[PDB]
Design a protein around this nucleic acid. Structure first.
Lengths: 135, 81, 87, 80
RNA sequence: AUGGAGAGUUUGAUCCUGGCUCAGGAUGAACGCUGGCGGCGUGCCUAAUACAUGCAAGUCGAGCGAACGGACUGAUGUUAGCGGCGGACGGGUGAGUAACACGUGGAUAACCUACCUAUAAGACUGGGAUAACUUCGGGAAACCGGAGCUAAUACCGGAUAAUAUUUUGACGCAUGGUUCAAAAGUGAAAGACGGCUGUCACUUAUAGAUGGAUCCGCGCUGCAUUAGCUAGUUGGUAAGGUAACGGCUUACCAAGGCAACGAUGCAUAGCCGACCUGAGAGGGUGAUCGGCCACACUGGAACUGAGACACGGUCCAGACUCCUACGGGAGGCAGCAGUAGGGAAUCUUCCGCAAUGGGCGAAAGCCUGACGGAGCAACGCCGCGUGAGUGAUGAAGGUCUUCGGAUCGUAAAACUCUGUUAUUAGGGAAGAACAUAUGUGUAAGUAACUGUGCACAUCUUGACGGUACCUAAUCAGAAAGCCACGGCUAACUACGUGCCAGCAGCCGCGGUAAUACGUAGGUGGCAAGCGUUAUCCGGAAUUAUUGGGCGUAAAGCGCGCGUAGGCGGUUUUUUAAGUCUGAUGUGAAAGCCCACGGCUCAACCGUGGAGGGUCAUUGGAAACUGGAA
């Protein structure tokens, strides 16, 4: 635009909508209010453990878990790895990162953490997927 | 709480309050009497005014009122006189 | 009141001091009025000291009161001597 | 010392011993650099209210008079 | 000149447009796997949630009365108290606050200021009490109330005293100013010394310094699907009171005042120096350090005081928690540790006043969870390690194999070699300058002396800490892991599975011959760290001022008339608001950059510059923009 049009109407940049919104909100049990926190991870309770069919191009039974976080927020989280020991009423640690196939899963359950075991036979890539150094 | 210095400071505060309020009460009585005598031009206006100026400056020395407040009262009294 | 004192400017076990005119109520490493000089007590052998003369004698005449060791520092430059000469 | 002086235009004389002086000045834009005209209204004291709406007058600051006025009328130069 | 990199992805194929994603740098980070050391830092970002328990503000017996108590008349203590000063500092937190709160620049001829400094004038004369103590009562504590005594630098009354107030004459609007010549009325202390005086208590005036207070220009979040806001509101006149101006408050007048240049309202937020990112312009942020502000369980109020409407002060209300003989009482960690709770997440219920700073004191000293140090945590930055020289890129063993070999690989034994580290066994800093005391002179003032200021040299002391650090022996021994290897993007093979199990940032892979899944070898990237997640800038010219566009990709209002605003033909004269060029003042310090110096280097530290403003005042220029003719 012209300089005068810019002076009257300064340029407005676009706002950035962030992924993993449920990690950006805290809770205050005393005031019954939601806060803004920007947490790396959040801890929740598994209210449902099951398996989800993936998007159309792919075909594989993917394990997931419905997790109610520390907030009053109920999200769906992926379970990386082969074997998992999670049933209902399991405390998990949930990080960011979505699954492309699974529609409605925007988070990942951290393996090898509070009440979540690692992958039994993992030998290369043990930082991810939990599990300690064999021998 | 109750630090030893604080517990004593309460006793010396009421002690100073009792002495202070008696003195300004006497001052304010004199000031009211002085300006009411000036208004009707009584025969005793002059020493009542002098009694008020005396008590006003005595309290301003005791930090009961500020010095600048004493002049406003004093200036008011002698101007009407 | 106004005090001529030392402000710590050193790291762990390596203190450096500035000779500063500051109010007594101010924090040690906080608000100041004027910087006068420096004091390094950990230099090679003798503690190297640097003091200005015009401002130091200006604040002393204005009623600034040196602390115990600023007195020593001002004495090693004869500042307290010349302050005494002008009675 | 010196108290600041402004020259503006009388835009209100509906109050006694008080006029409103419009001191228009210029402020550049931080980003684009264009100078934009902006105006500021000053409430000034004048015991003898000889200023009438439309006069350019001389204004100098002073101690607080009333809740808003901080200026006095120094010189009236226009007629309108 | 010191500074600017792209790539993948729409199609049968292409060029555009356009979005998405990745490669970089960061954090008070958390999580996963690992983990040797040191030095500098950093460490509840959430519940301004609730707090068990310890400490965080006392000092002066040279101000003075003790039942004082008591060496030996009684040194010394403060048992306890009156009195003075301090408790308004220091420390903590960011709830509230969109405001002259904060930054910057000014103004106050509308202002207060204890201690500190200097100059003067002084410090006269009397009086009555009361703490403490004794003895009676109450009350469950907390405490409270009677009598009888006693001091003070405690309190009160007179004397005298200013530039204090009233009336008098001799500028920048409210004026300021210092002479005059009258009136009223305003003080004080003693203590410990020496031969009358010294010191440090005092009182009154001045100034200075310091610390506060108020006002103003400019700057400083989002929302217009928040458009009309206010009625002490806005101005005036009186009065009051405030350190001080002022609707600050109250009466009476008038109807005023602000607002598309965003009144008001709503939501959010402590502000700044500064930090991160970027080539820059900019964008994001407001941990630690420093300046300002506000707050102290929530909410009102005042007292004392120079200064508070007061974190470890008072009164009241409220919500909690505790005691009670039920009438009544006590409490406030957003001080340092620490506990419970919330959370992904953030530490010892430590040592010392040895240094610096602060309070009080003549000082010795006392207090100081300020501070100086230790404890824990790879949380970060920096530095050093975990071995080296020769030695067959052949043992034996894995993995492939074209079965010939190849690769791990000079890697290993193998000999020599070192001790950074580690162990033990001896030395062992700096930080220390003092204050006081002691002597010695000098200066001022002294009748003189004591005493004070100054000059010198003596004596003293360290938490850290037997800790840095050094020196001897001894051993390669006790010291590496993490992630990747399809392309972006450095690193490929075999086996297992067979659109399953699973991987994935995107393109996507996996359906019996996956360099994309799991494992094994090898490789590569880093390394006491390596990856993942969370958030910001970049790349993004993807808000384009620098630096984009609107024929068909998104975008010209259906078209006029027009108001504010924005812009505006040629010449001359003038002005100087912009513009340009100087000079002053300031833009604190700490930060960034440059240089230099000290830690064995570095991190780090310290010095000196530089830089930083729509800044203020004041000259100069007059082409352009602006004003006037």
């Amino acid at each position: 635009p012209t300089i005068n049009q810019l002076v009257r109407k300064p340029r407005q940049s676009k706002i950035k909508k962030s992924d993993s919104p449920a990690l950006n909100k805290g809770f205050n049990s005393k005031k019954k209010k939601f806060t803004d926190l920007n947490s790396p991870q959040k801890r929740g309770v598994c209210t449902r453990v099951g398996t989800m069919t993936p998007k159309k191009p792919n075909s594989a039974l993917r394990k997931y878990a419905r997790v109610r976080l520390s907030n009053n927020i109920e999200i769906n989280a992926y379970i990386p790895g082969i074997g998992h020991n999670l049933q209902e009423h399991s405390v998990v640690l949930v990080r960011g990162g979505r699954v492309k196939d699974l529609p409605g899963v925007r988070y990942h359950i951290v393996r090898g953490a509070l009440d979540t075991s690692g992958v039994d036979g993992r030998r290369q890539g043990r930082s991810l997927y939990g599990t300690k150094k064999p021998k | 709480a109750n630090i030893k210095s604080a517990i004593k400071r309460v006793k010396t505060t009421e002690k100073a309050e009792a002495r202070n309020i008696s003195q300004k009460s006497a001052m304010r009585t004199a000031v009211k009497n002085a300006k009411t005598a000036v208004s009707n031009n009584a025969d005793n206006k002059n020493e009542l005014v002098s009694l008020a100026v005396k008590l006003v400056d005595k309290a301003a020395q005791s930090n009961l009122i500020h010095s600048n407040k004493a002049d406003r009262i004093k200036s008011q009294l002698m101007t009407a006189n | 009141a106004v005090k001529i004192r030392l402000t710590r400017l050193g790291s762990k076990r390596n203190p450096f001091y500035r000779i500063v005119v500051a109010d007594a109520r101010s924090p040690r490493d906080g608000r100041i009025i004027e910087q006068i000089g420096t004091y390094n007590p950990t230099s090679a052998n003798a503690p190297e000291i640097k003091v200005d003369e015009a401002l130091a004698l200006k604040w002393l005449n204005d009623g600034a009161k040196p602390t115990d060791t600023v007195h020593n520092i001002l004495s090693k430059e004869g500042i307290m001597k010349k302050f005494d000469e002008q009675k | 010392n010196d108290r600041k002086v402004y020259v503006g235009k009388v835009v209100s004389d509906k109050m006694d011993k008080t006029i409103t002086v419009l001191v228009e000045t210029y402020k550049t834009h931080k980003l684009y650099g264009k100078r934009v005209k902006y105006s500021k209204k000053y409430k000034t004291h004048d015991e003898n209210n000889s200023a009438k709406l439309g006069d350019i007058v001389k204004i100098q600051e002073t101690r607080p008079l009333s809740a808003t006025k901080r200026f006095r009328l120094v010189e009236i130069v226009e007629e309108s």
